[PDB]
Structures are given as C-alpha cells and as structure tokens.
Design a protein around this nucleic acid. Structure first.
Lengths: 98, 48, 71
RNA sequence: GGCAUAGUUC
DNA sequence: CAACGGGCGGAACTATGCC
DNA sequence: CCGTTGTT
C-alpha cells in the first residue's frame, strides 16, 4: 500500500532530478563564458513548489506535461458531509485495476 | 512551401515540408492514425 | 517521509582548466510560514492559501572550498 | 465559456 | 500462420483544476 | 474477441 510517504517521495525524486538538471544547464551556460558563477540565481524553487502543489491539487500523479499516462484518482478532496464520512474517507484504499 | 519553391530549395527542404504538410492535413482529417506524432497545441492536449 | 526520505533523496543524487563541483549536504524544515509570520490552518482555509513549509539545503561550492548554508 | 478528473443517485 | 484494427449501458446530480 | 490482409 503506497501511502503519503512513498507517494510524495516518488513524486519528489523527479522534481529534485529536474532541479539538478536545470542548475547543471545554467552552470554550463554561465561557465562556457568563463566569467563567474552564482548559486542562488541557478536554482528554480518554482519547480519543486509548483510540482508538488499541482500534483496534490489535481490528482494526476506526475508531471504536468505528461498527464496522459499519469494515474488520476490520488489526492481527492476531503468529504465533509458527516464525521463518519470524513473518517471513512481518511481511511481508504484503492485498486488501480480498470 | 510556396516561398521555398519560388526562391529555390536544397532538394530536401521541399520534401521535408511536403511531408510536414501531409502530416498536418492528415491529422486535421483524423488524429488517431497508428504510429503518428499525434499533434497537440498547448498543455499537451491532443486536438479534435 | 519528512524525516528520512527527503534526506535520502538529496544524498543519493550524484554531485554535479578550471573546474566547479557542487555537493548537497543536508536539509532543514521550518514550521509553516506565510510570506507577504506563522500561518494557521484556518487562515490558510479562509484566504485560499497553501499550508506549506520551506525546505533548505546546504550546498558546497569548490573550484579546482566554499560553503553555502540554508539554500 | 470549453476540456479534463473525482464523487454520488437509480 | 501472423499481424492489424475496431468494438465494448442507460440516465441523472454535485464538485475542482485548467486553458 | 474476432473480422481483414500479408506472408509464406
């Protein structure tokens, strides 16, 4: 059973990899000139922030560009009709079978 | 393609452009052929 | 997840004539705050905000060492 | 305005 | 005999994210 | 799952 830990860790691995790719690209572009290099300007926090926020907001578990094979149905909006509804929503499983 | 065929091309730009126009027209007719680029416009959503 | 998995993911990432090398050391997490200041969950609900905390990291810059804290 | 996803009734 | 393509219920009601 | 078309 993939709970919040495994789900968010799998999601975060890709975003950290993308952040490393972007800082690498920026460093190479700024270093081929040979002038200098900076760290803060090389890091795009928007990647991690927007990626986590989007995946939690829509439920399509993956990157926005590839929301075709992304498995939808994770991260539903909490049911608040009754306390029993809230509890039974918070303790719920799912079989990805079609 | 009209401009290229007027000003003269390199005998392969014309062929590539012909293939590209063929792809665009074919996808306009039907966008579900097996083994095609599957043209999109924005946000990754395929056309209709 | 917060205690172990993010740290492991940071650590297992491979590090990236003059040469430059970087190596991320360890992470940090403050309690959730709002930037315009702690942000309470009810305020996050009322103002259509997002309840979140910032993640920092130590990154070391070397030329062939210089330390950058709380990136 | 439209696209998508989720839940529910019979 | 093997590869390819089309086919797969009916209605209805809310909500949320995004172009 | 099973109707077309190819290959052999």
């Amino acid at each position: 059973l993939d709970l919040a830990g495994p789900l968010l860790a799998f999601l975060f691995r890709g975003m950290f990899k993308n952040l490393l790719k972007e800082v690498r690209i920026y460093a190479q572009k700024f270093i081929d000139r040979g002038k200098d290099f900076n760290l803060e300007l090389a890091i795009k926090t928007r990647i991690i922030s927007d990626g986590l926020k989007y995946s939690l907001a829509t439920g399509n578990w993956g990157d926005q560009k590839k929301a075709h094979q992304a498995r939808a149905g994770v991260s539903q909006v909490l049911n608040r009709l009754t306390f029993a509804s809230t509890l039974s929503h918070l303790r719920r499983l799912n079989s990805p079978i079609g | 393609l009209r401009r290229n065929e007027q000003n003269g091309a390199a005998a392969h730009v014309i062929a590539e452009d012909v293939k590209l126009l063929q792809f665009h027209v074919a996808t306009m007719v039907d966008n579900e052929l097996p083994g095609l680029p599957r043209a999109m416009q924005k946000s990754g959503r395929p056309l209709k | 997840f917060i205690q172990m998995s993010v740290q492991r993911i940071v650590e297992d990432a491979p590090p990236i004539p003059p040469r430059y090398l970087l190596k991320f050391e360890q992470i940090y997490l403050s309690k959730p705050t709002h930037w315009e200041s702690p942000m309470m969950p009810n305020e996050a609900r009322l103002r259509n905000l997002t309840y979140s905390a910032p993640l920092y990291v130590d990154i070391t810059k070397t030329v062939i060492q210089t330390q950058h804290q709380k990136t």
